[PDB]
Design a binder for this molecule. Structure first.
Ligand SMILES: [Zn+2]
Length: 325
Protein backbone atom coordinates (compact mmCIF):
# COMPACT_ATOMS: atom_id res chain seq x y z
CA UNK A 1 0.00 0.00 0.00
CA UNK A 2 0.92 3.70 -0.04
CA UNK A 3 2.83 5.72 2.53
CA UNK A 4 1.37 9.02 3.71
CA UNK A 5 4.22 11.17 5.00
CA UNK A 6 4.23 13.53 7.97
CA UNK A 7 7.89 14.45 8.49
CA UNK A 8 9.35 14.96 5.03
CA UNK A 9 10.63 18.30 6.37
CA UNK A 10 12.42 16.59 9.26
CA UNK A 11 16.01 17.69 9.72
CA UNK A 12 18.68 16.34 12.05
CA UNK A 13 20.42 19.49 13.32
CA UNK A 14 23.76 17.83 14.10
CA UNK A 15 25.39 14.58 13.02
CA UNK A 16 27.40 11.93 14.89
CA UNK A 17 30.50 12.88 12.91
CA UNK A 18 30.49 16.25 14.65
CA UNK A 19 29.26 15.42 18.09
CA UNK A 20 29.00 12.28 20.23
CA UNK A 21 26.79 9.61 18.69
CA UNK A 22 23.62 8.90 20.64
CA UNK A 23 22.42 5.51 21.89
CA UNK A 24 18.86 5.11 23.21
CA UNK A 25 16.96 2.11 24.55
CA UNK A 26 13.18 2.38 24.48
CA UNK A 27 11.54 -0.33 26.58
CA UNK A 28 8.04 -0.90 25.35
CA UNK A 29 6.34 -2.24 28.46
CA UNK A 30 3.34 -4.49 28.89
CA UNK A 31 0.27 -4.32 31.17
CA UNK A 32 1.95 -2.27 33.93
CA UNK A 33 -0.31 -0.03 36.08
CA UNK A 34 0.89 3.36 37.31
CA UNK A 35 -0.68 2.88 40.74
CA UNK A 36 1.43 -0.21 41.54
CA UNK A 37 4.62 1.80 41.11
CA UNK A 38 6.37 2.60 44.38
CA UNK A 39 7.33 6.07 43.03
CA UNK A 40 3.66 6.86 42.40
CA UNK A 41 2.68 6.07 45.98
CA UNK A 42 2.26 2.30 46.01
CA UNK A 43 2.74 0.76 49.43
CA UNK A 44 5.05 -1.97 48.21
CA UNK A 45 8.51 -1.38 46.85
CA UNK A 46 7.96 -2.77 43.37
CA UNK A 47 10.92 -0.93 41.86
CA UNK A 48 13.74 -1.35 44.37
CA UNK A 49 16.62 -1.45 41.89
CA UNK A 50 15.43 1.64 40.00
CA UNK A 51 15.10 3.52 43.29
CA UNK A 52 18.87 3.23 43.74
CA UNK A 53 19.88 4.53 40.32
CA UNK A 54 20.79 8.21 39.90
CA UNK A 55 19.24 10.03 36.97
CA UNK A 56 15.91 8.18 36.81
CA UNK A 57 12.78 10.30 36.39
CA UNK A 58 9.33 8.90 37.20
CA UNK A 59 6.27 10.42 35.50
CA UNK A 60 3.16 10.27 37.67
CA UNK A 61 0.51 11.32 35.16
CA UNK A 62 0.76 9.28 31.97
CA UNK A 63 -2.28 8.01 30.07
CA UNK A 64 -2.05 5.38 27.33
CA UNK A 65 -3.61 5.81 23.92
CA UNK A 66 -5.75 2.73 24.34
CA UNK A 67 -6.16 -0.48 26.29
CA UNK A 68 -4.55 -3.12 24.10
CA UNK A 69 -1.23 -3.91 22.45
CA UNK A 70 -2.63 -3.77 18.92
CA UNK A 71 -4.20 -0.36 19.50
CA UNK A 72 -1.56 1.34 21.67
CA UNK A 73 1.77 0.26 20.20
CA UNK A 74 1.27 1.80 16.73
CA UNK A 75 -0.16 4.93 18.35
CA UNK A 76 3.00 5.20 20.50
CA UNK A 77 5.04 5.71 17.31
CA UNK A 78 2.46 7.70 15.33
CA UNK A 79 2.61 11.32 14.19
CA UNK A 80 -1.15 11.71 14.25
CA UNK A 81 -1.81 12.00 17.98
CA UNK A 82 -4.54 10.05 19.76
CA UNK A 83 -7.32 12.28 18.39
CA UNK A 84 -6.65 11.38 14.76
CA UNK A 85 -4.96 8.01 15.17
CA UNK A 86 -6.67 5.09 13.41
CA UNK A 87 -5.51 1.57 14.16
CA UNK A 88 -6.65 0.13 10.83
CA UNK A 89 -4.83 2.63 8.62
CA UNK A 90 -1.67 3.10 10.70
CA UNK A 91 0.02 0.81 8.26
CA UNK A 92 -0.25 3.51 5.61
CA UNK A 93 1.24 6.27 7.76
CA UNK A 94 4.89 7.29 8.10
CA UNK A 95 5.82 6.73 11.73
CA UNK A 96 8.63 8.12 13.84
CA UNK A 97 10.86 5.07 13.28
CA UNK A 98 10.53 5.54 9.52
CA UNK A 99 11.73 9.11 9.96
CA UNK A 100 14.66 8.32 12.22
CA UNK A 101 15.79 5.56 9.88
CA UNK A 102 15.69 7.91 6.95
CA UNK A 103 17.80 10.36 8.89
CA UNK A 104 20.49 7.77 9.50
CA UNK A 105 19.67 6.42 12.95
CA UNK A 106 20.21 2.65 13.18
CA UNK A 107 16.95 1.07 14.38
CA UNK A 108 16.75 -2.31 16.14
CA UNK A 109 13.57 -3.93 17.47
CA UNK A 110 13.89 -7.00 19.73
CA UNK A 111 10.60 -8.53 20.75
CA UNK A 112 9.72 -10.87 23.65
CA UNK A 113 6.02 -10.04 23.54
CA UNK A 114 4.45 -10.68 20.14
CA UNK A 115 5.67 -8.34 17.41
CA UNK A 116 5.81 -4.64 16.55
CA UNK A 117 2.13 -4.57 15.59
CA UNK A 118 3.08 -3.25 12.18
CA UNK A 119 5.37 -0.44 13.33
CA UNK A 120 8.50 -2.03 11.86
CA UNK A 121 6.83 -3.24 8.64
CA UNK A 122 8.24 -0.59 6.28
CA UNK A 123 11.81 -1.22 7.43
CA UNK A 124 14.12 -4.10 6.40
CA UNK A 125 13.17 -7.41 8.05
CA UNK A 126 16.64 -7.84 9.54
CA UNK A 127 16.00 -4.89 11.87
CA UNK A 128 13.33 -6.89 13.70
CA UNK A 129 14.35 -9.84 15.87
CA UNK A 130 12.12 -12.37 17.62
CA UNK A 131 13.26 -13.01 21.18
CA UNK A 132 10.27 -15.13 22.26
CA UNK A 133 12.05 -18.43 21.64
CA UNK A 134 15.39 -20.00 22.49
CA UNK A 135 16.70 -19.51 18.96
CA UNK A 136 17.67 -15.95 19.81
CA UNK A 137 16.94 -15.75 23.53
CA UNK A 138 19.59 -17.38 25.74
CA UNK A 139 17.48 -17.05 28.89
CA UNK A 140 14.53 -19.44 28.57
CA UNK A 141 15.41 -22.32 30.76
CA UNK A 142 15.20 -20.70 34.14
CA UNK A 143 11.62 -21.72 34.91
CA UNK A 144 9.28 -24.71 34.54
CA UNK A 145 7.43 -23.09 31.62
CA UNK A 146 10.51 -22.68 29.44
CA UNK A 147 9.34 -19.07 29.07
CA UNK A 148 11.89 -16.71 27.55
CA UNK A 149 12.79 -13.76 29.77
CA UNK A 150 13.04 -10.07 28.91
CA UNK A 151 16.65 -9.88 30.16
CA UNK A 152 17.59 -12.26 27.35
CA UNK A 153 17.04 -9.31 25.01
CA UNK A 154 20.14 -7.60 26.48
CA UNK A 155 22.46 -10.41 25.49
CA UNK A 156 24.83 -9.56 22.66
CA UNK A 157 23.71 -5.95 22.26
CA UNK A 158 27.42 -5.04 22.24
CA UNK A 159 27.52 -6.80 18.86
CA UNK A 160 24.90 -4.44 17.48
CA UNK A 161 26.80 -1.43 18.80
CA UNK A 162 30.04 -2.73 17.27
CA UNK A 163 28.27 -3.25 13.91
CA UNK A 164 27.08 0.34 13.99
CA UNK A 165 30.10 2.02 15.55
CA UNK A 166 29.87 5.78 15.63
CA UNK A 167 26.25 5.93 14.45
CA UNK A 168 23.17 7.14 16.29
CA UNK A 169 21.20 4.07 17.45
CA UNK A 170 17.68 3.48 18.76
CA UNK A 171 16.93 0.07 20.26
CA UNK A 172 13.38 -1.01 21.08
CA UNK A 173 12.96 -3.82 23.56
CA UNK A 174 9.38 -5.05 23.57
CA UNK A 175 8.68 -6.74 26.92
CA UNK A 176 6.52 -9.63 27.92
CA UNK A 177 6.37 -7.74 31.22
CA UNK A 178 3.16 -8.16 33.21
CA UNK A 179 1.11 -9.81 30.49
CA UNK A 180 -1.75 -11.84 31.97
CA UNK A 181 -3.77 -13.71 32.86
CA UNK A 182 -0.93 -16.00 34.02
CA UNK A 183 1.02 -13.36 35.97
CA UNK A 184 2.71 -16.14 37.98
CA UNK A 185 4.57 -17.31 34.90
CA UNK A 186 6.02 -13.88 34.12
CA UNK A 187 8.91 -13.99 36.59
CA UNK A 188 11.53 -16.41 37.89
CA UNK A 189 11.61 -17.69 41.48
CA UNK A 190 14.11 -15.07 42.67
CA UNK A 191 11.39 -12.42 42.17
CA UNK A 192 8.75 -14.35 44.13
CA UNK A 193 8.81 -11.81 46.97
CA UNK A 194 5.07 -11.53 47.61
CA UNK A 195 3.39 -14.84 48.45
CA UNK A 196 1.15 -16.76 48.10
CA UNK A 197 0.25 -16.21 44.45
CA UNK A 198 -2.62 -16.95 42.09
CA UNK A 199 -1.57 -19.92 39.95
CA UNK A 200 -4.51 -20.38 37.59
CA UNK A 201 -6.38 -18.53 34.83
CA UNK A 202 -9.75 -18.27 36.61
CA UNK A 203 -8.75 -14.98 38.22
CA UNK A 204 -12.03 -14.35 40.07
CA UNK A 205 -11.61 -17.62 41.98
CA UNK A 206 -8.19 -16.58 43.38
CA UNK A 207 -7.92 -14.66 46.62
CA UNK A 208 -7.52 -11.05 45.54
CA UNK A 209 -4.34 -10.61 47.58
CA UNK A 210 -2.80 -13.62 45.79
CA UNK A 211 -3.60 -12.09 42.41
CA UNK A 212 -2.01 -8.80 43.49
CA UNK A 213 1.02 -10.69 44.78
CA UNK A 214 1.67 -12.36 41.42
CA UNK A 215 1.18 -9.07 39.59
CA UNK A 216 3.62 -7.29 41.93
CA UNK A 217 6.23 -10.04 41.57
CA UNK A 218 6.05 -9.53 37.83
CA UNK A 219 6.75 -5.83 38.35
CA UNK A 220 9.87 -6.73 40.36
CA UNK A 221 11.18 -8.61 37.33
CA UNK A 222 10.51 -5.57 35.16
CA UNK A 223 12.34 -3.34 37.67
CA UNK A 224 15.27 -5.74 37.26
CA UNK A 225 15.11 -5.68 33.47
CA UNK A 226 15.07 -1.89 33.36
CA UNK A 227 17.91 -1.66 35.86
CA UNK A 228 20.01 -4.04 33.74
CA UNK A 229 19.16 -2.08 30.59
CA UNK A 230 20.48 1.06 32.26
CA UNK A 231 23.60 -0.75 33.41
CA UNK A 232 24.22 -1.95 29.87
CA UNK A 233 23.86 1.62 28.57
CA UNK A 234 26.16 2.83 31.19
CA UNK A 235 28.98 0.68 29.84
CA UNK A 236 28.76 2.65 26.57
CA UNK A 237 28.65 6.14 28.09
CA UNK A 238 32.28 6.95 27.16
CA UNK A 239 31.62 6.69 23.43
CA UNK A 240 27.87 7.44 23.32
CA UNK A 241 25.32 9.79 24.83
CA UNK A 242 23.06 7.17 26.43
CA UNK A 243 19.40 7.34 27.53
CA UNK A 244 16.56 4.96 28.36
CA UNK A 245 12.83 5.51 28.00
CA UNK A 246 10.20 3.16 29.44
CA UNK A 247 6.44 3.37 28.81
CA UNK A 248 3.82 0.64 29.21
CA UNK A 249 1.32 0.00 26.39
CA UNK A 250 -1.68 0.04 28.79
CA UNK A 251 -2.63 -0.84 32.36
CA UNK A 252 -4.67 -3.70 33.73
CA UNK A 253 -7.85 -4.28 35.69
CA UNK A 254 -7.37 -6.43 38.80
CA UNK A 255 -10.91 -7.20 39.91
CA UNK A 256 -12.26 -3.70 40.44
CA UNK A 257 -16.03 -3.91 39.84
CA UNK A 258 -15.36 -7.43 38.75
CA UNK A 259 -13.36 -6.44 35.71
CA UNK A 260 -10.15 -8.32 34.82
CA UNK A 261 -7.44 -7.99 32.18
CA UNK A 262 -7.73 -5.15 29.65
CA UNK A 263 -8.81 -4.31 26.12
CA UNK A 264 -12.02 -2.45 26.95
CA UNK A 265 -13.08 0.29 24.49
CA UNK A 266 -11.76 3.72 25.54
CA UNK A 267 -15.29 5.09 25.91
CA UNK A 268 -16.02 2.62 28.72
CA UNK A 269 -12.61 1.53 30.01
CA UNK A 270 -11.81 2.04 33.67
CA UNK A 271 -8.94 4.34 34.66
CA UNK A 272 -6.80 1.32 35.65
CA UNK A 273 -6.57 0.22 32.02
CA UNK A 274 -5.03 3.49 30.80
CA UNK A 275 -2.92 4.81 33.72
CA UNK A 276 0.63 3.68 32.91
CA UNK A 277 4.07 4.21 34.35
CA UNK A 278 6.81 5.98 32.41
CA UNK A 279 10.45 6.33 33.34
CA UNK A 280 13.30 8.23 31.76
CA UNK A 281 16.99 7.77 32.52
CA UNK A 282 19.97 9.51 31.01
CA UNK A 283 23.68 9.66 31.75
CA UNK A 284 25.13 12.75 33.48
CA UNK A 285 26.87 14.03 30.33
CA UNK A 286 24.06 13.96 27.79
CA UNK A 287 22.53 17.37 28.47
CA UNK A 288 19.01 15.91 28.22
CA UNK A 289 16.60 17.42 30.73
CA UNK A 290 13.41 15.60 31.75
CA UNK A 291 10.11 17.45 32.04
CA UNK A 292 8.51 17.89 35.48
CA UNK A 293 7.45 14.58 37.03
CA UNK A 294 3.80 15.67 37.19
CA UNK A 295 3.51 16.93 33.61
CA UNK A 296 0.22 15.77 32.11
CA UNK A 297 1.44 13.25 29.56
CA UNK A 298 0.10 10.68 27.10
CA UNK A 299 1.50 8.30 24.49
CA UNK A 300 1.45 11.34 22.15
CA UNK A 301 4.60 12.48 23.98
CA UNK A 302 6.67 9.53 22.74
CA UNK A 303 7.21 10.64 19.12
CA UNK A 304 8.56 14.15 19.95
CA UNK A 305 10.68 12.59 22.72
CA UNK A 306 12.35 10.18 20.28
CA UNK A 307 12.92 13.00 17.77
CA UNK A 308 14.39 15.31 20.42
CA UNK A 309 16.71 12.54 21.64
CA UNK A 310 18.31 12.50 18.19
CA UNK A 311 18.35 16.28 17.59
CA UNK A 312 15.60 16.15 15.00
CA UNK A 313 12.87 18.66 14.45
CA UNK A 314 9.68 18.10 12.47
CA UNK A 315 6.93 20.68 11.98
CA UNK A 316 4.20 18.14 12.75
CA UNK A 317 5.22 17.85 16.41
CA UNK A 318 7.03 21.18 16.79
CA UNK A 319 5.21 22.39 19.87
CA UNK A 320 4.02 19.05 21.19
CA UNK A 321 4.73 18.17 24.83
CA UNK A 322 7.43 15.53 25.25
CA UNK A 323 8.94 13.63 28.21
CA UNK A 324 12.00 15.86 27.83
CA UNK A 325 12.82 19.52 27.20
ZN1 LIG B 1 -0.44 -5.08 26.14
Amino acid sequence: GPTIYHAKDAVQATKPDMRKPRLVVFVVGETARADHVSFNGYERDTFPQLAKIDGVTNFSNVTSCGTSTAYSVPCMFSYLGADEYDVDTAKYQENVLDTLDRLGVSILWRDNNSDSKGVMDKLPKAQFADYKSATNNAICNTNPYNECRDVGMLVGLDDFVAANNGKDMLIMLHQMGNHGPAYFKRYDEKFAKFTPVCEGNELAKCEHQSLINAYDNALLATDDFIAQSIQWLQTHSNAYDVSMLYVSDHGESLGENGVYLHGMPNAFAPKEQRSVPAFFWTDKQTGITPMATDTVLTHDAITPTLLKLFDVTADKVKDRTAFIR
